Amino acid sequence: GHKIKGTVVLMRKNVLDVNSVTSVTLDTLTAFLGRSVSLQLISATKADANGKGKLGKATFLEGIITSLPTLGAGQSAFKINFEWDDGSGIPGAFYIKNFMQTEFFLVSLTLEDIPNHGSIHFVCNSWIYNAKLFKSDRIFFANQTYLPSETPAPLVKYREEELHNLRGDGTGERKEWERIYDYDVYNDLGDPDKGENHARPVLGGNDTFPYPRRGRTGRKPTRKDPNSESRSNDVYLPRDEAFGHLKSSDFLTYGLKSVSQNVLPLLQSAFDLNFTPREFDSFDEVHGLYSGGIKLPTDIISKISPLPVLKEIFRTDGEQALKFPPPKVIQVSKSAWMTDEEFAREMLAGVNPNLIRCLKDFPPRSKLDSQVYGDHTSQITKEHLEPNLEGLTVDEAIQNKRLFLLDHHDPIMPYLRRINATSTKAYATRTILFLKNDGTLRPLAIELSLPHPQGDQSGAFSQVFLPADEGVESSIWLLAKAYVVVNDSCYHQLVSHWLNTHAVVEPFIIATNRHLSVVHPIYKLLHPHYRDTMNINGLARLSLVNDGGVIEQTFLWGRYSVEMSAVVYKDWVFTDQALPADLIKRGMAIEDPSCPHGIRLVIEDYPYTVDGLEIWDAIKTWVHEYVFLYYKSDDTLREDPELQACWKELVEVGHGDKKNEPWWPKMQTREELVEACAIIIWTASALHAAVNFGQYPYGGLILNRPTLSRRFMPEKGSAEYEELRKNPQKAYLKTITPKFQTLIDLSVIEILSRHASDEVYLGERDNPNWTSDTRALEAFKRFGNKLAQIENKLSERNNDEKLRNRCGPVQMPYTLLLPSSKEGLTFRGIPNSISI
Ligand SMILES: CCCCC[C@H]1O[C@@H]1[C@@H](O)/C=C\CCCCCCCC(=O)O
Ligand SMILES: [Fe+3]
């Protein structure tokens, strides 16, 4: 016979729970010693009566192992020997039963085997609730990755079974301890019961507002509307998708939620009352935000200061003062943001450097229906370009690819009259930029469009303004770019960020868990990039993009914010999400086998793109090596039932509204899976970081990144034009986001732009030893080494003086694509997943 030695590693709840960590021998671990936790080995080679592997005797935990050279923080180890013997096969999985009442996080199990076999490792990382709540014991598998063959015959039934356990079908209200993954439409952002004005359109499951599906939660429907789901202070997400933290400071989502319930009202009581002026009177009043900070009543400062997480982040001067960290944008020069140079630069290296396009014709047209501003150009004339520069015809300019455009016209046009009827006054902008010979981009003309002169047909009511270095013409031009940036800020926030990243990824996380076994090779490749994504998205539906959320209250599109992104989703295509595909689609690059990445870039000094191509290639190379390690032929792929079931569900369900698009890759080729996995991973890591981490550094100054517009362009000589003359600064302040909203926006994007101390970066980072496949382990080490190589390569670039665009007049070297970072508001770092 024999006795297999086992080592169990877990963490107690009050080591990861936010309530406990509020503050962050004694042996509480003695509670785990009686008959509190039992494990039961399952044979991987010895099949019982029919197929199903053979279970071992139920063994309870006996003994604390006070120390291991490899232990860790907040972790607890226990010894437990299992009775085994030659003939009982090799352990391949096991069942765990928690009788403790209080749940615990099981990290792992190691086995000092018996027959000619080395230690067997199990990486668990799961919350084990009381055994009373499941009816089917929580199962865990060994370190080995296996194709859907489910390989070990005796294990095959245990594999599909757990799969069935994860889907759970679509009925009932999900509870906190469950691990069920399923889809549902966006129908919980609104509050129809609290007013017909609070009802919001259901996004998805219809032609008009298509949308990716979100994680199903089954609360009862709304009274006033059955098609709507009841609101709750607790959105459910399969347990485990919600990651805990050892420190009271890394619970960023908590900080965001508490900023939307506690910080908001209390903050308005200071305005609604009078303890603070309602509007900024000068740029100087805005700069004081990072020096002295908003003097706030003592009463308030006592509450919005001690609460968990909101520490440090909320710089306080003891009392009253509510200082803000100075954004990197005004650290060196608090005036460079006004540069046309910096305005255009941020289009290539800013918070949203993904939109710019290369003009193919002139004047730029529209994608709108039968109205005439779509049936026929914009009002930017050929005798409006180049006010002193080179001196090339518009054709010659286009011919040598020197003209670029930032088109913010179509998405907001259809909703303009509606939006202009509120306290918000906006335009549907377009701006043309010329590529100077010095390598810089310069704004040549901005076109401010309004809707319907009369009626709606031929609703092309536009006014084009041109750069002006002098007098009131510069004040008018500085307001002109502000109307564009307000458009951009909003598109970025709702589409570039929320939609192209957060929303689009959720269906993949659901589809993956529902059909790929934890033991499946592809599951293990993708999993790290899904970390905490469903959790942050749940907070979003709760306090960000909801009925009266922060986004509806802080951005230009207002209450129509999300519907519009769903209208934008109309044009989303998975395969164009791959960076090289994106670049070409926009005319920013052309296919060229000669070049270091198969493509030739227009504007070589395009930070986001030059850096991103490196990381894109790094990711893609890594996935390819990993994939071809497991799939022998293309047929091996067409035979994978779990993968095939997974892709079909993603297409037909998760993104069900596009299930009929002809650009969906067929999982018939190994090359198509590499591509699909590369894009997903690219989206979850580098894309989100590139779009999410430069929010405060650039936008932490409302002047540089305004969120909403409250005034139309002052006219000819009216008293609005006369004040622009006498006081331009005040004319600017009255046109952009008011003081109260500026305070909200800064509070939120300062958290959003942070790195938690326990962030797992793309930088070859995982949790423990995910696999026993040595070959994969090595490929993963190569990936990591190439990343470190890349980081140095990019830092050198930031030193190259011939690449002004990486720094601009603001002297802000582009570091958003550097793989590593230390923690906090670092203008750098690429997390494995969308974690905030
Ligand atoms: C605990 C933190 C959770 C974060 C939740 C985030 O997902 C939400 C996000 O996608 C949705 C909208 C963010 C909009 C910000 C865009 C501002 C950019 C404008 C500029 O400054 O120039
Ligand atoms: Fe984000």
JSON list of N, CA, C and O in Angstrom, two decimals, residues 195-238:
[
{"chain": "A", "resi": 195, "resn": "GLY", "atom": "N", "xyz": [-39.57, 56.22, -12.61]},
{"chain": "A", "resi": 195, "resn": "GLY", "atom": "CA", "xyz": [-39.86, 57.24, -13.60]},
{"chain": "A", "resi": 195, "resn": "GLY", "atom": "C", "xyz": [-39.65, 56.90, -15.07]},
{"chain": "A", "resi": 195, "resn": "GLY", "atom": "O", "xyz": [-38.59, 56.43, -15.48]},
{"chain": "A", "resi": 196, "resn": "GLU", "atom": "N", "xyz": [-40.68, 57.18, -15.87]},
{"chain": "A", "resi": 196, "resn": "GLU", "atom": "CA", "xyz": [-40.67, 56.94, -17.31]},
{"chain": "A", "resi": 196, "resn": "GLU", "atom": "C", "xyz": [-39.52, 57.70, -17.97]},
{"chain": "A", "resi": 196, "resn": "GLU", "atom": "O", "xyz": [-39.20, 57.49, -19.14]},
{"chain": "A", "resi": 197, "resn": "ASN", "atom": "N", "xyz": [-38.89, 58.58, -17.20]},
{"chain": "A", "resi": 197, "resn": "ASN", "atom": "CA", "xyz": [-37.77, 59.38, -17.69]},
{"chain": "A", "resi": 197, "resn": "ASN", "atom": "C", "xyz": [-36.45, 58.64, -17.40]},
{"chain": "A", "resi": 197, "resn": "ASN", "atom": "O", "xyz": [-35.42, 58.93, -18.01]},
{"chain": "A", "resi": 198, "resn": "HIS", "atom": "N", "xyz": [-36.52, 57.69, -16.47]},
{"chain": "A", "resi": 198, "resn": "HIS", "atom": "CA", "xyz": [-35.37, 56.90, -16.06]},
{"chain": "A", "resi": 198, "resn": "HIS", "atom": "C", "xyz": [-35.25, 55.60, -16.85]},
{"chain": "A", "resi": 198, "resn": "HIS", "atom": "O", "xyz": [-34.31, 54.83, -16.64]},
{"chain": "A", "resi": 199, "resn": "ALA", "atom": "N", "xyz": [-36.19, 55.35, -17.75]},
{"chain": "A", "resi": 199, "resn": "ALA", "atom": "CA", "xyz": [-36.14, 54.14, -18.55]},
{"chain": "A", "resi": 199, "resn": "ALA", "atom": "C", "xyz": [-35.07, 54.34, -19.61]},
{"chain": "A", "resi": 199, "resn": "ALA", "atom": "O", "xyz": [-34.96, 55.42, -20.19]},
{"chain": "A", "resi": 200, "resn": "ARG", "atom": "N", "xyz": [-34.29, 53.30, -19.85]},
{"chain": "A", "resi": 200, "resn": "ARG", "atom": "CA", "xyz": [-33.22, 53.38, -20.85]},
{"chain": "A", "resi": 200, "resn": "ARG", "atom": "C", "xyz": [-33.38, 52.21, -21.82]},
{"chain": "A", "resi": 200, "resn": "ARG", "atom": "O", "xyz": [-33.76, 51.11, -21.41]},
{"chain": "A", "resi": 201, "resn": "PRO", "atom": "N", "xyz": [-33.09, 52.42, -23.11]},
{"chain": "A", "resi": 201, "resn": "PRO", "atom": "CA", "xyz": [-33.23, 51.35, -24.11]},
{"chain": "A", "resi": 201, "resn": "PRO", "atom": "C", "xyz": [-32.46, 50.06, -23.81]},
{"chain": "A", "resi": 201, "resn": "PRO", "atom": "O", "xyz": [-31.38, 50.09, -23.22]},
{"chain": "A", "resi": 202, "resn": "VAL", "atom": "N", "xyz": [-33.04, 48.93, -24.20]},
{"chain": "A", "resi": 202, "resn": "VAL", "atom": "CA", "xyz": [-32.38, 47.66, -23.98]},
{"chain": "A", "resi": 202, "resn": "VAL", "atom": "C", "xyz": [-31.40, 47.56, -25.14]},
{"chain": "A", "resi": 202, "resn": "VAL", "atom": "O", "xyz": [-31.76, 47.74, -26.31]},
{"chain": "A", "resi": 203, "resn": "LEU", "atom": "N", "xyz": [-30.13, 47.32, -24.81]},
{"chain": "A", "resi": 203, "resn": "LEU", "atom": "CA", "xyz": [-29.10, 47.23, -25.83]},
{"chain": "A", "resi": 203, "resn": "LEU", "atom": "C", "xyz": [-28.77, 45.78, -26.16]},
{"chain": "A", "resi": 203, "resn": "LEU", "atom": "O", "xyz": [-28.27, 45.04, -25.31]},
{"chain": "A", "resi": 204, "resn": "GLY", "atom": "N", "xyz": [-29.08, 45.38, -27.38]},
{"chain": "A", "resi": 204, "resn": "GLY", "atom": "CA", "xyz": [-28.81, 44.02, -27.82]},
{"chain": "A", "resi": 204, "resn": "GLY", "atom": "C", "xyz": [-30.08, 43.21, -28.07]},
{"chain": "A", "resi": 204, "resn": "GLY", "atom": "O", "xyz": [-31.11, 43.45, -27.46]},
{"chain": "A", "resi": 205, "resn": "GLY", "atom": "N", "xyz": [-29.99, 42.24, -28.96]},
{"chain": "A", "resi": 205, "resn": "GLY", "atom": "CA", "xyz": [-31.16, 41.42, -29.25]},
{"chain": "A", "resi": 205, "resn": "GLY", "atom": "C", "xyz": [-32.14, 42.10, -30.19]},
{"chain": "A", "resi": 205, "resn": "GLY", "atom": "O", "xyz": [-33.31, 41.73, -30.25]},
{"chain": "A", "resi": 206, "resn": "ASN", "atom": "N", "xyz": [-31.65, 43.10, -30.92]},
{"chain": "A", "resi": 206, "resn": "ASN", "atom": "CA", "xyz": [-32.48, 43.81, -31.88]},
{"chain": "A", "resi": 206, "resn": "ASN", "atom": "C", "xyz": [-31.59, 44.56, -32.87]},
{"chain": "A", "resi": 206, "resn": "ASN", "atom": "O", "xyz": [-30.42, 44.84, -32.58]},
{"chain": "A", "resi": 207, "resn": "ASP", "atom": "N", "xyz": [-32.14, 44.84, -34.05]},
{"chain": "A", "resi": 207, "resn": "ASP", "atom": "CA", "xyz": [-31.41, 45.52, -35.13]},
{"chain": "A", "resi": 207, "resn": "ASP", "atom": "C", "xyz": [-30.93, 46.93, -34.85]},
{"chain": "A", "resi": 207, "resn": "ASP", "atom": "O", "xyz": [-29.80, 47.28, -35.19]},
{"chain": "A", "resi": 208, "resn": "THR", "atom": "N", "xyz": [-31.78, 47.76, -34.26]},
{"chain": "A", "resi": 208, "resn": "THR", "atom": "CA", "xyz": [-31.45, 49.15, -33.98]},
{"chain": "A", "resi": 208, "resn": "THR", "atom": "C", "xyz": [-30.26, 49.38, -33.04]},
{"chain": "A", "resi": 208, "resn": "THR", "atom": "O", "xyz": [-29.35, 50.14, -33.37]},
{"chain": "A", "resi": 209, "resn": "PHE", "atom": "N", "xyz": [-30.28, 48.73, -31.88]},
{"chain": "A", "resi": 209, "resn": "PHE", "atom": "CA", "xyz": [-29.19, 48.87, -30.92]},
{"chain": "A", "resi": 209, "resn": "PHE", "atom": "C", "xyz": [-28.51, 47.53, -30.65]},
{"chain": "A", "resi": 209, "resn": "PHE", "atom": "O", "xyz": [-28.72, 46.92, -29.61]},
{"chain": "A", "resi": 210, "resn": "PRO", "atom": "N", "xyz": [-27.69, 47.04, -31.60]},
{"chain": "A", "resi": 210, "resn": "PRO", "atom": "CA", "xyz": [-27.04, 45.75, -31.31]},
{"chain": "A", "resi": 210, "resn": "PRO", "atom": "C", "xyz": [-25.96, 45.99, -30.26]},
{"chain": "A", "resi": 210, "resn": "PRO", "atom": "O", "xyz": [-25.46, 47.10, -30.11]},
{"chain": "A", "resi": 211, "resn": "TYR", "atom": "N", "xyz": [-25.62, 44.94, -29.52]},
{"chain": "A", "resi": 211, "resn": "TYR", "atom": "CA", "xyz": [-24.62, 45.07, -28.47]},
{"chain": "A", "resi": 211, "resn": "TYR", "atom": "C", "xyz": [-24.10, 43.69, -28.06]},
{"chain": "A", "resi": 211, "resn": "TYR", "atom": "O", "xyz": [-24.77, 42.67, -28.27]},
{"chain": "A", "resi": 212, "resn": "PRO", "atom": "N", "xyz": [-22.86, 43.63, -27.54]},
{"chain": "A", "resi": 212, "resn": "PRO", "atom": "CA", "xyz": [-22.33, 42.34, -27.11]},
{"chain": "A", "resi": 212, "resn": "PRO", "atom": "C", "xyz": [-23.14, 41.95, -25.88]},
{"chain": "A", "resi": 212, "resn": "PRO", "atom": "O", "xyz": [-23.68, 42.84, -25.21]},
{"chain": "A", "resi": 213, "resn": "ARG", "atom": "N", "xyz": [-23.25, 40.66, -25.57]},
{"chain": "A", "resi": 213, "resn": "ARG", "atom": "CA", "xyz": [-24.00, 40.27, -24.40]},
{"chain": "A", "resi": 213, "resn": "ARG", "atom": "C", "xyz": [-23.15, 40.48, -23.16]},
{"chain": "A", "resi": 213, "resn": "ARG", "atom": "O", "xyz": [-21.93, 40.61, -23.26]},
{"chain": "A", "resi": 214, "resn": "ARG", "atom": "N", "xyz": [-23.80, 40.55, -22.00]},
{"chain": "A", "resi": 214, "resn": "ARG", "atom": "CA", "xyz": [-23.11, 40.73, -20.72]},
{"chain": "A", "resi": 214, "resn": "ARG", "atom": "C", "xyz": [-23.39, 39.51, -19.86]},
{"chain": "A", "resi": 214, "resn": "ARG", "atom": "O", "xyz": [-24.21, 38.66, -20.22]},
{"chain": "A", "resi": 215, "resn": "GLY", "atom": "N", "xyz": [-22.72, 39.42, -18.72]},
{"chain": "A", "resi": 215, "resn": "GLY", "atom": "CA", "xyz": [-22.90, 38.27, -17.85]},
{"chain": "A", "resi": 215, "resn": "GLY", "atom": "C", "xyz": [-24.28, 38.18, -17.24]},
{"chain": "A", "resi": 215, "resn": "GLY", "atom": "O", "xyz": [-24.69, 39.09, -16.52]},
{"chain": "A", "resi": 216, "resn": "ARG", "atom": "N", "xyz": [-25.00, 37.10, -17.50]},
{"chain": "A", "resi": 216, "resn": "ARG", "atom": "CA", "xyz": [-26.34, 36.97, -16.94]},
{"chain": "A", "resi": 216, "resn": "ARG", "atom": "C", "xyz": [-26.44, 36.95, -15.42]},
{"chain": "A", "resi": 216, "resn": "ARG", "atom": "O", "xyz": [-25.67, 36.30, -14.73]},
{"chain": "A", "resi": 217, "resn": "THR", "atom": "N", "xyz": [-27.42, 37.69, -14.94]},
{"chain": "A", "resi": 217, "resn": "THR", "atom": "CA", "xyz": [-27.77, 37.79, -13.53]},
{"chain": "A", "resi": 217, "resn": "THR", "atom": "C", "xyz": [-29.28, 37.70, -13.74]},
{"chain": "A", "resi": 217, "resn": "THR", "atom": "O", "xyz": [-29.80, 38.22, -14.73]},
{"chain": "A", "resi": 218, "resn": "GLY", "atom": "N", "xyz": [-30.00, 37.00, -12.87]},
{"chain": "A", "resi": 218, "resn": "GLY", "atom": "CA", "xyz": [-31.43, 36.87, -13.11]},
{"chain": "A", "resi": 218, "resn": "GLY", "atom": "C", "xyz": [-32.41, 37.50, -12.15]},
{"chain": "A", "resi": 218, "resn": "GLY", "atom": "O", "xyz": [-33.40, 36.86, -11.78]},
{"chain": "A", "resi": 219, "resn": "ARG", "atom": "N", "xyz": [-32.17, 38.74, -11.75]},
{"chain": "A", "resi": 219, "resn": "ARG", "atom": "CA", "xyz": [-33.07, 39.43, -10.83]},
{"chain": "A", "resi": 219, "resn": "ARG", "atom": "C", "xyz": [-34.44, 39.45, -11.49]},
{"chain": "A", "resi": 219, "resn": "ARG", "atom": "O", "xyz": [-34.56, 39.27, -12.70]},
{"chain": "A", "resi": 220, "resn": "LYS", "atom": "N", "xyz": [-35.49, 39.66, -10.69]},
{"chain": "A", "resi": 220, "resn": "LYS", "atom": "CA", "xyz": [-36.83, 39.71, -11.26]},
{"chain": "A", "resi": 220, "resn": "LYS", "atom": "C", "xyz": [-36.93, 40.96, -12.11]},
{"chain": "A", "resi": 220, "resn": "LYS", "atom": "O", "xyz": [-36.23, 41.95, -11.85]},
{"chain": "A", "resi": 221, "resn": "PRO", "atom": "N", "xyz": [-37.79, 40.94, -13.14]},
{"chain": "A", "resi": 221, "resn": "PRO", "atom": "CA", "xyz": [-37.95, 42.10, -14.03]},
{"chain": "A", "resi": 221, "resn": "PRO", "atom": "C", "xyz": [-38.55, 43.32, -13.33]},
{"chain": "A", "resi": 221, "resn": "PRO", "atom": "O", "xyz": [-39.02, 43.25, -12.20]},
{"chain": "A", "resi": 222, "resn": "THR", "atom": "N", "xyz": [-38.51, 44.45, -14.02]},
{"chain": "A", "resi": 222, "resn": "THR", "atom": "CA", "xyz": [-39.01, 45.69, -13.46]},
{"chain": "A", "resi": 222, "resn": "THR", "atom": "C", "xyz": [-40.54, 45.71, -13.48]},
{"chain": "A", "resi": 222, "resn": "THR", "atom": "O", "xyz": [-41.17, 45.12, -14.37]},
{"chain": "A", "resi": 223, "resn": "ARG", "atom": "N", "xyz": [-41.14, 46.35, -12.49]},
{"chain": "A", "resi": 223, "resn": "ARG", "atom": "CA", "xyz": [-42.60, 46.44, -12.41]},
{"chain": "A", "resi": 223, "resn": "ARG", "atom": "C", "xyz": [-43.18, 47.11, -13.65]},
{"chain": "A", "resi": 223, "resn": "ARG", "atom": "O", "xyz": [-43.98, 46.52, -14.37]},
{"chain": "A", "resi": 224, "resn": "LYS", "atom": "N", "xyz": [-42.76, 48.35, -13.89]},
{"chain": "A", "resi": 224, "resn": "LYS", "atom": "CA", "xyz": [-43.23, 49.14, -15.02]},
{"chain": "A", "resi": 224, "resn": "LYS", "atom": "C", "xyz": [-42.86, 48.58, -16.40]},
{"chain": "A", "resi": 224, "resn": "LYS", "atom": "O", "xyz": [-43.47, 48.94, -17.41]},
{"chain": "A", "resi": 225, "resn": "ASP", "atom": "N", "xyz": [-41.86, 47.70, -16.44]},
{"chain": "A", "resi": 225, "resn": "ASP", "atom": "CA", "xyz": [-41.40, 47.08, -17.69]},
{"chain": "A", "resi": 225, "resn": "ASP", "atom": "C", "xyz": [-40.88, 45.67, -17.44]},
{"chain": "A", "resi": 225, "resn": "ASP", "atom": "O", "xyz": [-39.90, 45.46, -16.73]},
{"chain": "A", "resi": 226, "resn": "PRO", "atom": "N", "xyz": [-41.53, 44.67, -18.03]},
{"chain": "A", "resi": 226, "resn": "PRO", "atom": "CA", "xyz": [-41.02, 43.32, -17.77]},
{"chain": "A", "resi": 226, "resn": "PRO", "atom": "C", "xyz": [-39.69, 43.09, -18.47]},
{"chain": "A", "resi": 226, "resn": "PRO", "atom": "O", "xyz": [-38.85, 42.34, -17.99]},
{"chain": "A", "resi": 227, "resn": "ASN", "atom": "N", "xyz": [-39.50, 43.75, -19.61]},
{"chain": "A", "resi": 227, "resn": "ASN", "atom": "CA", "xyz": [-38.28, 43.60, -20.40]},
{"chain": "A", "resi": 227, "resn": "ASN", "atom": "C", "xyz": [-37.06, 44.21, -19.74]},
{"chain": "A", "resi": 227, "resn": "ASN", "atom": "O", "xyz": [-35.95, 44.10, -20.25]},
{"chain": "A", "resi": 228, "resn": "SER", "atom": "N", "xyz": [-37.27, 44.87, -18.61]},
{"chain": "A", "resi": 228, "resn": "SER", "atom": "CA", "xyz": [-36.16, 45.49, -17.89]},
{"chain": "A", "resi": 228, "resn": "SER", "atom": "C", "xyz": [-35.90, 44.68, -16.63]},
{"chain": "A", "resi": 228, "resn": "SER", "atom": "O", "xyz": [-36.81, 44.05, -16.08]},
{"chain": "A", "resi": 229, "resn": "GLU", "atom": "N", "xyz": [-34.65, 44.70, -16.16]},
{"chain": "A", "resi": 229, "resn": "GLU", "atom": "CA", "xyz": [-34.28, 43.96, -14.97]},
{"chain": "A", "resi": 229, "resn": "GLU", "atom": "C", "xyz": [-34.17, 44.87, -13.76]},
{"chain": "A", "resi": 229, "resn": "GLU", "atom": "O", "xyz": [-33.69, 45.99, -13.86]},
{"chain": "A", "resi": 230, "resn": "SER", "atom": "N", "xyz": [-34.64, 44.37, -12.62]},
{"chain": "A", "resi": 230, "resn": "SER", "atom": "CA", "xyz": [-34.61, 45.12, -11.37]},
{"chain": "A", "resi": 230, "resn": "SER", "atom": "C", "xyz": [-33.19, 45.55, -11.03]},
{"chain": "A", "resi": 230, "resn": "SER", "atom": "O", "xyz": [-32.23, 44.86, -11.35]},
{"chain": "A", "resi": 231, "resn": "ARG", "atom": "N", "xyz": [-33.08, 46.69, -10.36]},
{"chain": "A", "resi": 231, "resn": "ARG", "atom": "CA", "xyz": [-31.78, 47.20, -9.96]},
{"chain": "A", "resi": 231, "resn": "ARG", "atom": "C", "xyz": [-31.46, 46.67, -8.58]},
{"chain": "A", "resi": 231, "resn": "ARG", "atom": "O", "xyz": [-32.37, 46.40, -7.78]},
{"chain": "A", "resi": 232, "resn": "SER", "atom": "N", "xyz": [-30.18, 46.49, -8.30]},
{"chain": "A", "resi": 232, "resn": "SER", "atom": "CA", "xyz": [-29.72, 45.99, -7.02]},
{"chain": "A", "resi": 232, "resn": "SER", "atom": "C", "xyz": [-28.37, 46.59, -6.68]},
{"chain": "A", "resi": 232, "resn": "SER", "atom": "O", "xyz": [-27.62, 46.99, -7.56]},
{"chain": "A", "resi": 233, "resn": "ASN", "atom": "N", "xyz": [-28.07, 46.65, -5.39]},
{"chain": "A", "resi": 233, "resn": "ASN", "atom": "CA", "xyz": [-26.81, 47.20, -4.92]},
{"chain": "A", "resi": 233, "resn": "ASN", "atom": "C", "xyz": [-25.74, 46.16, -5.03]},
{"chain": "A", "resi": 233, "resn": "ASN", "atom": "O", "xyz": [-24.60, 46.39, -4.63]},
{"chain": "A", "resi": 234, "resn": "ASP", "atom": "N", "xyz": [-26.11, 45.00, -5.57]},
{"chain": "A", "resi": 234, "resn": "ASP", "atom": "CA", "xyz": [-25.18, 43.90, -5.70]},
{"chain": "A", "resi": 234, "resn": "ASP", "atom": "C", "xyz": [-25.39, 43.13, -6.99]},
{"chain": "A", "resi": 234, "resn": "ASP", "atom": "O", "xyz": [-26.29, 42.30, -7.07]},
{"chain": "A", "resi": 235, "resn": "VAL", "atom": "N", "xyz": [-24.56, 43.40, -7.99]},
{"chain": "A", "resi": 235, "resn": "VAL", "atom": "CA", "xyz": [-24.67, 42.67, -9.25]},
{"chain": "A", "resi": 235, "resn": "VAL", "atom": "C", "xyz": [-23.86, 41.38, -9.09]},
{"chain": "A", "resi": 235, "resn": "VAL", "atom": "O", "xyz": [-22.78, 41.38, -8.50]},
{"chain": "A", "resi": 236, "resn": "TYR", "atom": "N", "xyz": [-24.40, 40.28, -9.61]},
{"chain": "A", "resi": 236, "resn": "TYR", "atom": "CA", "xyz": [-23.70, 39.02, -9.49]},
{"chain": "A", "resi": 236, "resn": "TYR", "atom": "C", "xyz": [-22.79, 38.75, -10.68]},
{"chain": "A", "resi": 236, "resn": "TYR", "atom": "O", "xyz": [-23.06, 39.17, -11.81]},
{"chain": "A", "resi": 237, "resn": "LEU", "atom": "N", "xyz": [-21.70, 38.06, -10.39]},
{"chain": "A", "resi": 237, "resn": "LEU", "atom": "CA", "xyz": [-20.73, 37.63, -11.39]},
{"chain": "A", "resi": 237, "resn": "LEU", "atom": "C", "xyz": [-20.25, 36.29, -10.82]},
{"chain": "A", "resi": 237, "resn": "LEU", "atom": "O", "xyz": [-20.12, 36.14, -9.60]},
{"chain": "A", "resi": 238, "resn": "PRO", "atom": "N", "xyz": [-20.03, 35.28, -11.68]},
{"chain": "A", "resi": 238, "resn": "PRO", "atom": "CA", "xyz": [-19.57, 34.01, -11.12]},
{"chain": "A", "resi": 238, "resn": "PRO", "atom": "C", "xyz": [-18.45, 34.22, -10.10]},
{"chain": "A", "resi": 238, "resn": "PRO", "atom": "O", "xyz": [-17.50, 34.97, -10.35]}
]
